[PDB]
Symmetry: C3
Subunit: 114 residues, 3 copies
Amino acid sequence: PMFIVNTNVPRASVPDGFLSELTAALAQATGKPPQYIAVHVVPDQLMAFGGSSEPCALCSLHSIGKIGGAQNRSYSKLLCGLLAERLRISPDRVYINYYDMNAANVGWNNSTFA
Amino acid sequence: PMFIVNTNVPRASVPDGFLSELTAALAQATGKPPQYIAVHVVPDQLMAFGGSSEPCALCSLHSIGKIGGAQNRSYSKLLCGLLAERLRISPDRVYINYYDMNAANVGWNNSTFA
Amino acid sequence: PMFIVNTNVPRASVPDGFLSELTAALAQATGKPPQYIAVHVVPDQLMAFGGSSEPCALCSLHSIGKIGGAQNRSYSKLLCGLLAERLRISPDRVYINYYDMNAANVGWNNSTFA
């Protein structure tokens, strides 16, 4: 699984430990080992949400399976909760796009997961 | 809806008001209230289009519905027009990927839109 | 086609000519003229793979067709190989997400490819 967060929050506001906390949380949530979790945080972005430049985030989670109605609700609660507690971003200023990737469309270690 | 522009145009060439203008134009184009529109501009990128480093942009528009043949043509005319007028990027050096997201696959406010 | 690499490798470790090399390689691999190939490299990223900050990359390849089981295996061997040779990233610390785009969902030159 891969989680990317783009945000206008400044780099200095990202706490130590944030990638590691995301990694462990996403391993637990998705049922995949932490060795398979990739995370990427991109602060200091030029963005607006609802025409306002208050803190906000535009995120993605890609996974081969483990994506669906109830699972994505659970991910959203988890991930909004973390963005709120660690980056002080209001949950209603977060969008997360979920992608259920076909194994044949995910490259790794010179091949694909198919 | 969420619109992201990645460009090699430098930050100083992005005019004041660009995110606001995109916000309002996309609200109008999609028929969604501006409170729903997120915009993100990423200047100064290391990118090439056709093997040339002249101004170019790689963009995305994600929306729950409001995506389809004729709509996407209309968005492209709108968005290439803005990139040409404001960032001096030629329309033939712009790619925009359109994504029709399922509401279940969009997180917001601790949940999803499903 | 459009290839994006996000990496924690620093900007100074990206060799001059890397974008051109990726352009040529992808033109050959996809069978498209180089004029259609767009490439984007984003170094110095805050990212982790498996909880570790050793060199890694999260990439995408979008193309209108030319995506499938065997092709994507081939692209992954090519692209992992280039990342390993040129950026010194281990292939087992690379994810590449492949996207087969509909021509109606790709904007260019004030319209779409449909």
